[PDB]
Swiss-Prot record, chain A:
InterPro entries for the chain: Mediator_Med11
Outcome (variant: E14K): Results in a decrease of TFIIK and RNA polymerase II occupancies at active promoters
Protein name: Mediator of RNA polymerase II transcription subunit 11
Effect of L21K: Results in a decrease of TFIIK and RNA polymerase II occupancies at active promoters
Keywords: Activator, Coiled coil, Nucleus, Transcription, Transcription regulation
Localisation: Nucleus
Organism from which the protein derives: Saccharomyces cerevisiae (strain ATCC 204508 / S288c) (Baker's yeast)
Annotated family: Belongs to the mediator complex subunit 11 family.
Pfam families to which the protein is assigned, alphabetical: Med11
Source superkingdom: Eukaryota
Coiled coil start-end: 53-95
Additional detail: Present with 396 molecules/cell in log phase SD medium.
GO process terms (BP): negative regulation of transcription by RNA polymerase II; positive regulation of transcription by RNA polymerase II; positive regulation of transcription elongation by RNA polymerase II; positive regulation of transcription initiation by RNA polymerase II; RNA polymerase II preinitiation complex assembly
UniProtKB/Swiss-Prot annotation, chain B:
One BP annotation, GO: positive regulation of transcription by RNA polymerase II
Protein name: Mediator of RNA polymerase II transcription subunit 18
Organism expressing this protein natively: Saccharomyces cerevisiae (strain ATCC 204508 / S288c)
Function statement: Component of the Mediator complex, a coactivator involved in the regulated transcription of nearly all RNA polymerase II-dependent genes. Mediator functions as a bridge to convey information from gene-specific regulatory proteins to the basal RNA polymerase II transcription machinery. The Mediator complex, having a compact conformation in its free form, is recruited to promoters by direct interactions with regulatory proteins and serves for the assembly of a functional preinitiation complex with RNA polymerase II and the general transcription factors.
Top-rank taxon, per record: Eukaryota
Entry annotated with the keyword Transcription: yes
Location of the protein in the cell: Nucleus
UniProtKB/Swiss-Prot annotation, chain C:
Main location: nucleus
Localization of this protein: Nucleus
The protein's name in its UniProt record: Mediator of RNA polymerase II transcription subunit 17
Function summary: Component of the Mediator complex, a coactivator involved in the regulated transcription of nearly all RNA polymerase II-dependent genes. Mediator functions as a bridge to convey information from gene-specific regulatory proteins to the basal RNA polymerase II transcription machinery. The Mediator complex, having a compact conformation in its free form, is recruited to promoters by direct interactions with regulatory proteins and serves for the assembly of a functional preinitiation complex with RNA polymerase II and the general transcription factors.
Higher taxonomy: Eukaryota, Fungi, Dikarya, Ascomycota, Saccharomycotina
GO biological process per UniProt: cellular response to heat; positive regulation of transcription by RNA polymerase II; positive regulation of transcription elongation by RNA polymerase II; positive regulation of transcription initiation by RNA polymerase II; regulation of transcription by RNA polymerase II; RNA polymerase II preinitiation complex assembly; transcription initiation at RNA polymerase II promoter
Positions spanned in the full protein: 182 to 687 of 687
Similarity-based family: Belongs to the Mediator complex subunit 17 family.
Organism: Saccharomyces cerevisiae (strain ATCC 204508 / S288c)
Any one Gene Ontology cellular component term annotated for this protein: mediator complex
Transmembrane parts of this sequence: none
Curated annotation (Swiss-Prot), chain D:
Protein name: Mediator of RNA polymerase II transcription subunit 22
GO biological process, one term: positive regulation of transcription initiation by RNA polymerase II
Leftover remarks: Present with 2181 molecules/cell in log phase SD medium.
GO terms, molecular function: transcription coregulator activity
Domain of life: Eukaryota
Subunit structure: Component of the Mediator complex, which is composed of at least 21 subunits that form three structurally distinct submodules. The Mediator head module contains MED6, MED8, MED11, SRB4/MED17, SRB5/MED18, ROX3/MED19, SRB2/MED20 and SRB6/MED22, the middle module contains MED1, MED4, NUT1/MED5, MED7, CSE2/MED9, NUT2/MED10, SRB7/MED21 and SOH1/MED31, and the tail module contains MED2, PGD1/MED3, RGR1/MED14, GAL11/MED15 and SIN4/MED16. The head and the middle modules interact directly with RNA polymerase II, whereas the elongated tail module interacts with gene-specific regulatory proteins.
InterPro entries: Med22, Med22_Saccharomyce
Residues that span the membrane, as ranges: none
Alphabetized UniProt keyword annotations: Acetylation, Activator, Nucleus, Transcription, Transcription regulation
Length: 103, 253, 487, 109
């Protein structure tokens, strides 16, 4: 089905969230260097920092959006017996044809 | 026979969905069917008391002749063609199949006649709050006819009845558990001055079970339950309810 | 992803000593702080001075036995000044930056193992992708009826009814593969052990020499090597088709039962062997225990019996698709439903019963009738056989239909296959001209029992005729016919 | 319905927003921020308890942050689940069956 697309959009939003983590983890160790007085990477600190904010805001819009979509999909509109019953024949019949002549 | 039933309706909008749903609930496809019903009243020229040779208070009522019309006498276009009843019903909405239905009432298109379902029903069971519509029906099958005036119309006149009004219904029915039937239907008034769809806008929904007994309170009570379960299962999607009794009384009126 | 995050949130573990010692750590290291918060409850008795103070005091059982209100203080607001104003206090606030720093060092460390912990969860993202690639039956088990364990999946039989133990049930492993449960048929990802239906036909000839029998078996093996790849429901769709075949063998169990109505082999009630008299031969098998269970060496040689035998399986298999079909005729068609299977073993008998009949009976008997018609081999004569009896009843794929358009289609489907199921002997006739006479005979199988009912008219200016409906009498009737023929 | 389910997710998102901020801001306070200015209203006075703020921050903020994450990954895959909730026709065949019958059954004509 073509929803497998929307499914992959969310599984990727999932990787975005694991980035919210991965990114803010640097924010943790980098602010470690920063209050240690060694203003060495203060610009780099600012970078990965607005980056943790960025990843989660993108995730926030992306899954929030996905939820909006699912609500929209929701707004939008035994199977066993059917095909199986007939198809019986189709396989056995085609195979009975096959053993009668071939190649 | 006892007919316990629940009614409701859906706009043509809801049909597509309802269908997909009903197929899953029942596990059978909907099956396309139709039927014409011709209603007869006692000849208003004759006049009769309301009592028997066995002093019984007996009221005048209408008779209902019902049968299938093969679709060949009903359908507007082959292009539509196909086997699918729901997409086909949109094709049928608002207006009539060939009809002019008089023709068939007296043969045509030197003749004998078909089989009919000859019925007479009583008002649904008096009840302060019924969980289900319970209605009695007297029926006989006419197999064919014989004699001078063997057209169904002659026959009815011979018996002292007169044609009153008629209607065609086309729909799909679902065959289901413990004799439960679901009909999703459309009804068309048939007169000589043209045909109009009574159900224009949507489908009449009827879920029912005809019970042989009446006098087996148990199977009657089982049947109530069946219908209840259905209404209940679909509750929050469609309400199946008991129609007003007064609205199911085929008496003089 | 959610399930896997919920798994990590189930405390769950199978650790010996590893899991054991760790939880003991929690006990003692937590208990310490619990116990030291009790020194905190002892400062409560330390109030004394008030009744509400006594209340707080009884907190220790030893307070219950240490009556006194005991302690007292004075004023060193000066010492509060010293705490706050000391160069030591300025310095101590450095112990605040120091512990806080090492806390931030901890924080950094925790944060990084988190993204790598989300990385084991990307194994799952892949599993979901695998599931995205490649029935919506919704079930609940482990009883209770509310909560407990609840999930969803498809199964096999559907329209028309074998009856017992028939379905399918499906769940996902941590290897991103789906395991196929059956609600019995006991789980083994795309099955554990499978029995295909199988077949096998023996012939015992020897040119009527030493009673030596060999077989030959039409074999159904797609392969022994199995793929149904993990993370692939498309391969699982293939496994689902395999599941369908397994459900089909259950059908051959119904045919087993349908044997029970015949006098041809069912030995000890523990095994049943399909077999028939002529040329003594045997055809197909599957023990009252089962059908086809897999374990053998594999070499390719064929054999004439083997080729024929593959024809049997498809027929026998086919024949109960018929049953699987005329069941559904009734169901779709009329109120009650079809449930409970083959009363009179009329419906049942069709499977494996009418094939056996067919092969054996009509054929051997026709052959035998032909030798009897060699007893009428005497006159110059002539005599011919048709499908004429067959033509007269049981027409194939007719436009007529039944009650309905929907109904008509299925009826039609039945009919052409219905030739096979109907297979009684057609019958035959012979005739003479010159002031002209005529006779005729029909072979009827009723369940492998053979009737030969004949007719005969000698057409001339004034008519004379007789018709008669046992093989002993047939021989005799032929002898009487020679006399009343020309001669 | 779907609405109520989402509301929770939105709340979780708001929670996730409000705690890396507390980890950052409380970092200042944890590092100790004693003010010559009298107006500033953050305190870290007493020994144990003011560096205890640092031990609580660790468990609180870091697990609230990571927790908002764990709950939000549940939220995600929950919606995913929600979405995964979801020949020889003719008499021609009569001929075929006759072929098989003659084939399997004996006699050579």
């Amino acid at each position: 089905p073509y929803i497998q697309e929307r499914l992959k959009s969310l599984n990727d939003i999932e990787t975005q969230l694991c980035s919210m983590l991965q990114e803010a983890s640097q924010v943790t160790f980098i602010f470690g260097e920063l209050k240690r007085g060694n203003e060495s990477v203060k610009p780099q600190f600012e970078n990965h920092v607005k980056q943790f904010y960025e990843r989660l805001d993108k995730s926030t819009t992306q899954l929030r959006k996905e939820i909006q979509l699912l609500d929209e999909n929701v707004g939008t509109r035994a199977l066993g017996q059917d095909t199986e019953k007939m198809e019986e024949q189709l396989d056995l019949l085609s195979a009975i044809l096959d053993p009668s002549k071939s190649k | 026979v006892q007919q316990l039933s629940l009614f409701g309706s859906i706009g043509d909008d809801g049909y597509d969905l309802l269908i997909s749903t009903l197929t899953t609930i029942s596990g059978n496809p909907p099956l396309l069917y139709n039927s014409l019903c011709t209603v007869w009243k006692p000849n208003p020229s004759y006049d009769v008391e309301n009592v028997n040779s066995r002093n019984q208070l007996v009221e005048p009522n209408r008779i209902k002749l019902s049968k299938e019309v093969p679709f060949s006498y009903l359908i507007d276009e082959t292009m539509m063609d196909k086997p699918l009843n729901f997409r086909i019903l949109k094709s049928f909405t608002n207006d009539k199949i060939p009809l002019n239905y008089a023709m068939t009432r007296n043969i045509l298109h030197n003749e004998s006649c078909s089989p009919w379902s000859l019925q007479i029903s009583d008002i649904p069971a008096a009840g302060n709050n019924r969980s289900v519509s319970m209605q009695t029906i007297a029926e006989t099958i006419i197999l064919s006819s014989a004699g001078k005036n063997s057209s169904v119309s002659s026959l009815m006149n011979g018996l002292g009845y007169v044609f009153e009004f008629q209607y065609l219904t086309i729909g799909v029915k679902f065959f289901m558990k413990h004799g439960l039937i679901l009909e999703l239907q459309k009804i068309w008034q048939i007169e000589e001055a043209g045909n109009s769809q009574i159900t224009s806008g949507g489908f009449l929904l009827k879920a029912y079970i005809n019970v042989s007994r009446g006098t087996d309170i148990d199977r009657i009570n089982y049947t109530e339950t069946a219908l209840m379960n259905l209404k209940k299962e679909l509750q929050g999607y469609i309400e199946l309810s008991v129609p007003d009794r007064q609205s199911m009384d085929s008496r003089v009126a | 992803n959610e399930n896997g995050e919920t798994d990590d949130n189930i405390e769950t573990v199978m650790t010996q000593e590893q899991f054991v010692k760790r939880r003991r750590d929690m006990l003692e290291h937590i208990n310490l702080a619990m116990n030291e918060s009790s020194l905190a409850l002892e400062f409560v008795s330390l109030l004394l001075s008030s009744v509400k103070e006594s209340t707080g005091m009884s907190s220790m059982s030893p307070f219950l036995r240490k009556v006194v209100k005991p302690s007292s203080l004075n004023s060193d607001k000066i010492p509060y000044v010293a705490p706050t104003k000391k160069e030591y206090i300025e310095l101590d606030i450095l112990n605040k930056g120091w512990k806080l720093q090492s806390l931030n060092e901890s924080k950094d460390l925790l944060r990084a193992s988190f993204n790598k912990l989300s990385s084991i969860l990307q194994n799952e993202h892949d599993y979901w992708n695998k599931i995205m690639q490649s029935v919506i039956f919704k079930i609940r088990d482990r009883t209770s009826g509310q909560k407990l364990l609840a999930i969803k999946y498809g199964y096999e039989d559907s329209g028309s009814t074998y009856k017992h133990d028939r379905g399918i049930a499906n769940i996902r492993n941590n290897i991103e593969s789906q395991n196929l449960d059956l609600i019995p048929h006991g789980t083994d990802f795309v099955h554990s052990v499978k029995k295909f239906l199988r077949v096998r036909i023996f012939t015992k000839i020897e040119s009527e020499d030493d009673y030596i029998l060999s077989g030959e078996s039409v074999m159904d093996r797609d392969s022994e090597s199995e793929e149904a790849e993990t993370k692939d429901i498309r391969k699982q769709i293939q496994l689902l088709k395999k599941i369908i075949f397994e459900k089909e063998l259950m059908y051959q169990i119904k045919k087993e039962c349908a044997l029970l109505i015949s006098y041809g082999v069912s030995i000890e009630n523990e095994n049943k062997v399909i077999i028939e008299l002529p040329n003594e031969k045997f055809e197909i098998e599957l023990l009252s225990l089962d059908d086809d269970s897999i374990v053998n060496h594999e070499q390719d040689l064929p054999k004439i019996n083997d080729k024929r035998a593959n024809l049997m399986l498809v027929m026998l298999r086919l024949l109960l698709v018929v049953i699987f079909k005329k069941t559904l005729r009734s169901r779709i068609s009329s109120p009650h439903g079809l449930i409970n299977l083959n009363v009179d073993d009329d419906i049942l008998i069709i499977r494996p019963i009418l094939g056996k009949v067919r092969f054996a009976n009509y054929k051997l008997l026709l052959k035998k009738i032909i030798k009897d018609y060699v007893l009428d081999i005497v006159p110059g004569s002539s005599i011919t056989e048709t499908e004429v009896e067959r033509e007269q009843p049981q027409e194939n794929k007719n436009i007529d239909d039944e009650n309905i358009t929907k109904l008509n289609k299925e009826i039609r489907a039945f009919d052409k296959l219905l030739n096979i199921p109907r297979r009684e002997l057609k019958i035959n006739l012979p005739l003479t001209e010159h002031k002209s006479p005529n006779l005729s005979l029909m072979l009827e199988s009723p369940n492998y029992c053979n009737a030969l009912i004949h007719i005969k008219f000698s057409a001339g200016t004034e008519a004379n005729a007789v018709s008669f409906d046992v093989e002993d009498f047939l021989h005799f009737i032929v002898a009487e016919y020679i006399q009343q023929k020309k001669v | 319905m779907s609405n109520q389910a989402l509301y929770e997710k939105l709340e979780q998102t708001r929670t996730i927003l409000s705690v890396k901020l507390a980890e950052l801001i409380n970092m200042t306070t944890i590092a100790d921020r004693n003010d010559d200015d009298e107006g500033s209203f953050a305190q870290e006075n007493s020994e144990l308890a003011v560096a205890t703020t640092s031990v609580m921050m660790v468990n609180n903020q870091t697990m609230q942050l990571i927790k908002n994450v764990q709950d939000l990954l549940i939220l995600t895959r929950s919606i995913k689940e929600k979405w995964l909730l979801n020949f020889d026709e003719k008499q021609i065949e009569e001929l075929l069956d006759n072929c098989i019958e003659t084939f399997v059954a004996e006699k050579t004509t």
